[PDB]
Amino acid sequence: DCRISFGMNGAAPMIRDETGMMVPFEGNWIFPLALWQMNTRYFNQQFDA
């Protein structure tokens, strides 16, 4: 599951956890490789900065 909400009015954008949580772009994450592969261009413009 990958649902990404954009951050309106200075708030940070969030991504959906496996257990239904919405987390900002911090901390330690764990991906499977196929999750990056299916969404490589959409993840490059969000995460590489």
Q: From the list 12, 17, 22, 42, which residue makes contact with other proteins (rule: CB under 8 A)?
A: 42
The DSSP string of 1-39 is: ---EE---TTPPPEEE-TTS-EE-S-S-----HHHHHHT
Rounded Cα distance, 21 and 45, in Å:
22
Selected binder of other proteins within 10, 21, 27, 34 (CB under 8 A): 34
* Closer residue to other proteins in complex, CB, 29/39: 39
38 binds other proteins (CB under 8 A): yes
Q: Is 11 in the site for other proteins (CB under 8 A)?
A: no
